[PDB]
Amino acid sequence: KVFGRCELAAAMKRHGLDNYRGYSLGNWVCAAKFESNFNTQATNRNTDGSTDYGILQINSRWWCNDGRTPGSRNLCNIPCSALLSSDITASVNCAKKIVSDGNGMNAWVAWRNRCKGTDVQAWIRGCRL
Ligand SMILES: [Cl-]
Ligand SMILES: [Cl-]
């Protein structure tokens, strides 16, 4: 599913992400934009052979099981394919664990490089919510 911007903001809000660990809704929307272009089916292989999955490109090295990432964990206790669903519940629940792990949204390198220090509120500007 490719979310609209305001549609994704609203789904994230409903799942308790606006201001989760202090990170306003625009932070999450912006991260999603640059991680997946709002496509729940996005997958990308990493150099290390781990894979990033879904709207927030959650990585198989620590967070989900895909069966092909040697020496990995599955700290969200989820198959990585659950992160590709049209329903973002699994991605949001697992993002909450990630952003609580000590480095906040710096866990997302694309958030650090493309969202952090920007007018992230622009990502939810105009949205009803
Ligand atoms: Cl915001
Ligand atoms: Cl933080």
Swiss-Prot record:
Family: Belongs to the glycosyl hydrolase 22 family.
GO biological process: cell wall macromolecule catabolic process; defense response to bacterium; defense response to Gram-negative bacterium; defense response to Gram-positive bacterium; killing of cells of another organism
Domain C-type lysozyme: 1-129
Keyword hit for NADP: no
Species, as recorded: Gallus gallus (Chicken)
Top enzyme category: hydrolase
MF term (GO), any: identical protein binding
Positions of disulphide bridges: C6-C127, C30-C115, C64-C80, C76-C94
Cited PANTHER family: LYSOZYME C
Pfam families per the UniProt record, alphabetical: Lys
Protein's recorded name: Lysozyme C
Annotated GO CC locations: cytoplasm; endoplasmic reticulum; extracellular space
Miscellaneous notes: Lysozyme C is capable of both hydrolysis and transglycosylation; it also shows a slight esterase activity. It acts rapidly on both peptide-substituted and unsubstituted peptidoglycan, and slowly on chitin oligosaccharides.
UniProt-listed Gene3D superfamilies: 1.10.530.10
Principal localisation: secreted
